[PDB]
Enzyme design. Structure first.
Site, PDB file in Angstrom:
ATOM      1  CE  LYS D  33      41.707  36.657  54.600  1.00  0.00           C
ATOM      2  NZ  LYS D  33      41.536  36.378  53.149  1.00  0.00           N
ATOM      3  CE  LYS D  38      45.012  33.532  47.386  1.00  0.00           C
ATOM      4  NZ  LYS D  38      44.634  32.259  46.716  1.00  0.00           N
ATOM      5  CG  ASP D 151      42.642  46.906  57.432  1.00  0.00           C
ATOM      6  OD1 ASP D 151      42.685  47.997  56.825  1.00  0.00           O
ATOM      7  OD2 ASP D 151      43.333  45.920  57.107  1.00  0.00           O
TER       8      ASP D 151
END
Ligand code: PMR
Ligand code: SF4
Ligand SMILES: [Cu+2]
Ligand SMILES: [Mg+2]
Ligand SMILES: [Mg+2]
Lengths: 420, 401, 287, 290
Positions: D33, D38, D151
């Site tokens: 993310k 992470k 994304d």
């Protein structure tokens, strides 16, 4: 890129020219090539217009390219203003014009003529003629229709009636006589009988009447927020639709219904004993959206026919088309090709089909009775006799117009059996 | 008077409407937008209901954005339409305004198309758009396109060139055989049933005045035009056949005596309608380049008084005998702004007006009788049989008011 | 020749993105990375503008289909859903069949994210704006506001900048948000190279205003539009499906509404847009 | 040359490099993310293979420094991992001279921050895929990791999943998570024709007691794995300095590095694919959903 042999509509500039010639004091400048000038024939002749359509064309050629197109356009607009003297002017483009780097709006701004001008951006390859008429309508409305104080007496505006319309000259008369039936006055009839002053006063109505959706729906919605003008949703084609429309307008204006049933004869003649054999007759309908919707409603309810085929070339109104088709449990045929509808009427084989000139002629080839209930028509469909398609009188007109092919074929068959 | 302020004419795509009538083995693929399709559809009227040979494929945004996409779609579409019409052999990729502005090279496409289709089915293209041509220029552009493909002939043959109703062609052949000398080869041969050899040997004459590119096409082969008044009216046809006789060395007495009865019938027919149009004024508008011959016929045979004659383009080299027969009365004119000639029309008060259909009804409402030149191309007016009917077409003794 | 390949940099240099720069109304595209508040800020900005009296439509270009969701309070069927219900023919759609209204008559459109593994977000927003032009909703409206994911700013992701006259940004104190704003300024400058998109400024993410973002704006020649922290007062869960400017009132609510009102009026004026730069990555003071 | 079709023929937005299904070398993608989610999982897992003995081309694809710079210590120490250059190389085009040899295994780098700007993700990371291929880094290494973020779901931009085969998952414990993991699942079965990029399982970090989002993850037919962590991760500053394999092994709740090794015992090729499915917004609703 598909081969088309007969199309159901025209280029959007045709609809824009329809709205332009409907209302007086306008002139319409095409950035059209020389020879694309034919479009006034249909207006002078199919509609039988005594006056030249208020249009001027630059008629550029191979020698006039680049700057010469702009100079020719400027000269065309200047001479149009000088010799035609229009109260309102607008600038338009043809199919070839947008491909060339010619800015209609830029040229109009450079002219800087005192009369207000509007730039009509016509997607002549994305869209079709009715859209163009509607866009010209909303563009002129935002140009010179401004909100202003209500009238002393409740007033309505008829939006939708344009030139080259089906019977439009008659529908305006019938609707106007009905509204004078409740006594509500029509402030302005547009674009059939509009003028720059009429468009200016268009905001004076206490509500709008959508007489034809395809050419006035977007104008009505623009008036919804710009002018806070409610617009009626129901089209009064057929007796039941007439009553629904009467109730709607009586509610909006607040006046009593005061409907006049005196001249109506269609229900008695449909329930007449000679009309028993019409029951259970399959019918196929194609053409203009609201026209087909009302035709299917009138057939199934008041005629006794069974709607066996439904369709519409007005793709922008396929959603009402599909909704109605599901209402009758049918399959909407939204093709714009004559061959698909040809195959449809072959497979279904309805007893009677009511569409436009294409449907009439394919039924003639198929030996099927046919009548025209839609926009694309030849010269003889437009009559000198007043033939409203809507209202109580329009009910009788629709009735016997549908009756004629059936009785003609029936008596012909009776003759053939009888000399045999 | 060549003002370009505003023009009211038709695209040469209007030539396809009756051009296909001469050859029923000609399919026309129109690379045109929705507007040209609408023009062809409207003008044809009742044709579209009988499955013509006019294929007007709309240039959607998809194939107009690019160029080669339309080029391949052309091959796909012609294969499709050959499958639909196995009878069809000759194909024409007519030019149209969107194709010209996007500069689609129709010539190379037609050449490769004919190469891949083979000898049995042959496609030749031209451009009938309004950008470079107008109205009648489509037909002579088409035939000039098919001229080079016609093989050279080594036999001196009388040549007729020009799209013409079949009965008129048959009667012309009959009359020229009644002359006795001169084998007739029809360049717009019926459905290409006889490929007409054209070469230096075959000297030609002209029957349709508007055929401009025709002369160039036949000079490329080496054929020469012969000064001959165009066959409109009995005397026009008479002087035409006299010119054919002069070229082929036919005795004056023989041709005068042979054609006596047909021209007697023709003078009867023309006098049947001449009395209607005596002592009036006429105005001509640029419609189909057919106007100067009409003015000559009306003025000298029907007693007409021609105020003005408007022609979009004058090919004086071939229209010269027509002008010499024509009186000095009517002012000749090569392309007049429609408003200017409209002003001259209002000033002149023409009892009869010849123009396009689009102008016709406004002039009728203004009080001037109108005869639309879009008609006379369709109806047969071209010879002795139709000498009287030519005048009858302009009779219009309506006088309802 | 491996980099150029057959297309390589082709689709991104030539015909990089179709222009169609028809604005008419004032356009302000809010650009944030994520977590930092772009959608909530855009929604409250739309509410404040509607309070002012300007007609507002919001385009939820974010593929999560929640940017304009708050104003309505109910999940909006995105544009691509209707475009698939129809046979991808944009003309049977009508207004109020794909657009929906929010509180105080705020128009709002959601751009459905392109199908996973194919397509383009720029493609999607291009179809939304084209469909928007087709029914002429921009013509009546006075203010147009774009909510887009500023985390990725590639060509298709930069399509709303082509339309946007001013580019609003939101940021937090987190260093990831710092790199995000830097990338955002660089991409907005790139999009203002072709035609023009001006830089309105950046607001805080209600974490802590003018802690280090102000100095970063000074370094990058950017501006720091004022905004206040209301992290707990504004419920993280859209306050019961309902933004603060829409269906609530309280001292914190009132003052936050005041801040958004100042943002609205400043964007309405929107003069002297700063011309900032992108400060080097190495020069970025880091941890 | 391909003038139309690149953004034409229906505005086709493939990477315009034919088929990219071919794995670099047994590509093991790692989703995330955007740095905070992470992205060190790619670097740490590459280090795991490298310690095992399999060289990794762990492609972080992180414009900011969270994905692979942890493995490579200092951020872009020569600024030739930035990967954006007119000459397509900020240094000599020799594969050995090109960037650094990671810090374990043989050689490995991520994507930097490209100012490429204008252009679809079909090329922005679409080209970014193959400069490692241009100098045959995928050939020079035993295995490969192709890190992606939340994304990135869309194809062309999802070129790492075009090249990936056996991937693990990393995600949050909020609405953004339950959106992102199922959307990534959608992306990867969209890239299932591109060498069937796997769906091994998520490193989900429940903040305090978000067992309902983990129950939803189970409803997505999708395993939990690292359930224990509660917003507690290894030292962030030292993680920025170096990845966990190079940095002090500061486990937060359970045997974090030993859990990594236990995963890698079968994840050296890839953890057993749970084979989850994407789920709609009707069922994945998170009640209100922020
Ligand atoms: C683009 C102009 C146009 C239109 C709209 C029509 C339809 C039309 N074609 Mg005239 N037709 C046009 C031109 C032509 N039509 C043609 C066919 C034709 C004929 C023979 C006739 C005709 C007529 C019409 C009519 C009746 C109204 C009119 O006079 O135009 C329309 C709408 C009608 C007429 O002219 O009035 C008696 C008539 O005798 N169409 C031909 C082949 C020569 C051409 C070039
Ligand atoms: S804008 Fe870029 S990242 Fe977004 S879908 Fe299009 S190519 Fe992918
Ligand atoms: Cu009849
Ligand atoms: Mg978002
Ligand atoms: Mg880390």
């Amino acid at each position: 890129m598909k081969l088309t042999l007969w199309t159901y509509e025209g280029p959007p500039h045709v609809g824009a020219m329809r709205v332009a010639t409907g209302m007086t004091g306008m002139h319409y400048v095409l950035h059209a090539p020389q020879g694309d000038t034919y479009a006034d024939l249909l207006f002078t002749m199919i509609e039988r217009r005594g006056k030249r359509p208020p249009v001027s064309y630059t008629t550029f050629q191979a020698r006039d390219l680049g700057s010469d197109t702009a100079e020719l356009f400027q000269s065309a607009c200047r001479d149009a203003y000088e010799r035609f003297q229009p109260q309102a002017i607008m600038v338009g483009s043809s199919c070839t014009a947008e491909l060339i780097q010619d800015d209609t709006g830029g040229l109009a701004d450079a002219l800087s003529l005192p009369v207000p001008v509007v730039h009509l951006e016509l997607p002549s390859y994305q869209r079709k003629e009715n859209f163009g008429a509607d866009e010209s309508f909303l563009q002129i409305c935002r140009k010179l229709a401004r909100p202003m104080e209500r009238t002393e007496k409740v007033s309505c505006n008829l939006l939708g009636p344009t030139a080259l319309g089906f019977r439009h000259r008659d529908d305006i008369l019938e609707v106007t006589r009905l509204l004078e039936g409740m006594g509500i006055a029509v402030n302005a009839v547009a674009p059939m009988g509009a003028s720059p002053a009429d468009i200016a006063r268009l905001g004076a109505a206490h509500f709008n009447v959508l007489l034809y959706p395809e050419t006035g729906e977007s104008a009505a919605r623009w008036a919804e927020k710009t002018l806070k003008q409610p617009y009626t949703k129901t089209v009064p084609i057929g007796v039941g639709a007439t009553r629904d429309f009467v109730a709607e307008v009586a509610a909006l204006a607040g006046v009593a219904p005061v409907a006049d049933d005196s001249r109506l004869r269609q229900p008695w003649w449909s329930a007449s004993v000679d009309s028993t054999y019409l029951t259970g007759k399959r019918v196929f309908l194609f053409g203009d959206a609201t026209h087909v919707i009302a035709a299917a409603r009138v057939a199934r309810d008041e005629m006794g026919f069974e709607v066996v085929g439904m369709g519409c070339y007005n793709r922008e109104f396929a959603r009402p088309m599909r909704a109605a088709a599901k209402g009758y449990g049918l399959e909407a045929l939204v093709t714009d090709d004559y061959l698909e509808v040809e195959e449809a009427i072959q497979a279904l084989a309805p007893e009677l089909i009511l569409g436009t000139q294409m449907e009439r002629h394919i039924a003639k080839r198929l030996g099927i009775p046919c009548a025209v209930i839609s926009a694309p028509v030849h010269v003889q469909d437009f009559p000198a006799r007043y033939s409203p398609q809507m209202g109580f009188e329009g009910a009788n007109v629709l009735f016997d117009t549908w009756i004629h092919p059936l009785t003609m074929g029936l008596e012909e068959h009776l003759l053939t059996m009888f000399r045999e | 008077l060549k003002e370009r302020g505003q023009r009211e004419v038709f695209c040469g795509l209007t030539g396809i409407i009756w051009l296909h009538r001469k050859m029923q083995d000609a399919f026309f693929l129109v690379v045109g937008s929705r507007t040209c399709a609408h023009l062809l559809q409207s003008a044809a009227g009742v044709m579209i209901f009988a499955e013509p040979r006019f294929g007007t494929a709309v240039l959607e945004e998809k194939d107009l954005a690019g160029l080669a996409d339309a080029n391949a779609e052309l091959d796909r579409e012609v294969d499709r339409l050959l499958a639909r019409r196995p009878d069809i052999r000759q194909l024409f990729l007519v030019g149209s305004c969107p194709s010209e502005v996007i500069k689609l090279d129709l010539h190379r496409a037609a050449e490769r198309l004919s190469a891949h289709h083979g000898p049995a089915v042959r496609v030749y293209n031209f451009s009938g758009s309004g950008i470079e041509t107008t109205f009648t220029q489509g037909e002579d552009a088409c035939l000039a396109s098919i001229v080079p493909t016609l093989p050279a002939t080594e036999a001196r043959e009388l040549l007729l060139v020009g799209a013409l109703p079949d009965v008129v062609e048959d009667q012309a052949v009959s009359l020229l055989t009644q002359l006795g000398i001169g084998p007739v080869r029809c360049l717009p041969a019926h459905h290409a049933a006889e490929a007409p050899g054209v070469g230096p040997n075959t000297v030609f004459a002209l029957v349709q005045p508007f055929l401009g590119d025709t002369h160039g096409a036949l000079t490329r082969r080496g054929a020469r035009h012969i000064a001959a008044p165009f066959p409109f009216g009995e005397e026009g046809t008479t002087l035409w056949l006299k010119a054919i006789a002069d070229e082929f060395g036919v005795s004056a007495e023989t041709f005068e005596a042979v054609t006596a009865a047909p021209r007697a019938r023709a003078r009867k027919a023309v006098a049947a309608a001449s009395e209607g149009l005596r002592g009036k004024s006429v105005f001509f508008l640029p419609d189909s380049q057919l106007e100067p011959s009409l003015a000559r016929f009306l003025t000298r045979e029907c007693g007409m008084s021609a105020v003005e004659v408007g022609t979009p383009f004058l090919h004086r080299g071939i229209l010269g005998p027509d002008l010499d027969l024509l009186a000095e009365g009517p002012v000749l004119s090569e392309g007049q702004d429609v408003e200017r000639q409209l002003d001259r029309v209002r000033a002149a008060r023409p009892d009869l007006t010849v123009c396009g259909l689009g102008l016709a009804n406004p002039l009728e409402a203004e009080g001037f009788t109108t005869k639309w030149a879009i008609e006379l191309v369709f109806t047969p007016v071209h010879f002795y049989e139709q000498a009287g009917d030519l005048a009858g077409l302009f009779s219009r003794p309506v006088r309802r008011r | 020749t491996i980099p150029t390949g057959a297309d390589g940099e082709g689709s991104v240099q030539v015909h990089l993105d179709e222009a169609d720069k028809i604005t008419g109304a004032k356009v302000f595209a809010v650009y944030g990375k994520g977590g930092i508040g772009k959608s909530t800020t855009s929604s409250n900005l739309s509410a404040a503008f509607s309070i002012l009296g300007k007609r507002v439509l919001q385009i939820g270009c974010d593929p999560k289909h929640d940017s304009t969701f708050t104003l309505t309070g109910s999940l909006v069927p995105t544009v691509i859903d209707v475009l698939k219900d129809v046979d991808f023919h944009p003309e049977e759609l009508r207004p109020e069949d794909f657009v929906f209204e929010g509180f105080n008559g705020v128009m709002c459109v959601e751009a459905g994210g392109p199908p996973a593994g194919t397509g383009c977000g720029g493609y999607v927003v291009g179809q939304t704006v084209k469909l928007l032009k087709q029914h002429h909703l921009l013509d009546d409206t006075d203010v147009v506001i774009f909510d887009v994911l500023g985390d990725v700013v590639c060509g298709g992701f930069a399509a709303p900048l082509q339309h946007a006259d001013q580019a609003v940004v939101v940021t937090a104190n987190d260093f990831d948000s710092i790199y995000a704003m830097n990338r955002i300024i660089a991409a907005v400058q790139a999009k203002s190279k072709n035609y023009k998109v001006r830089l309105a400024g950046c607001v805080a993410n209600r974490s802590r205003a003018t802690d280090e973002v102000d100095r970063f704006c000074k370094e990058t020649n950017f501006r720091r539009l004022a905004h206040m922290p209301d992290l707990d007062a504004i419920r993280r869960s859209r306050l019961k499906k309902k933004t603060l400017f829409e269906m609530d009132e309280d001292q914190d609510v009132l003052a936050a509404r005041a801040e958004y009102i100042r943002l609205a009026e400043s964007l309405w004026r929107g003069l002297d847009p700063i011309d900032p730069h992108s400060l080097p990555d190495r020069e970025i003071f880091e941890l």
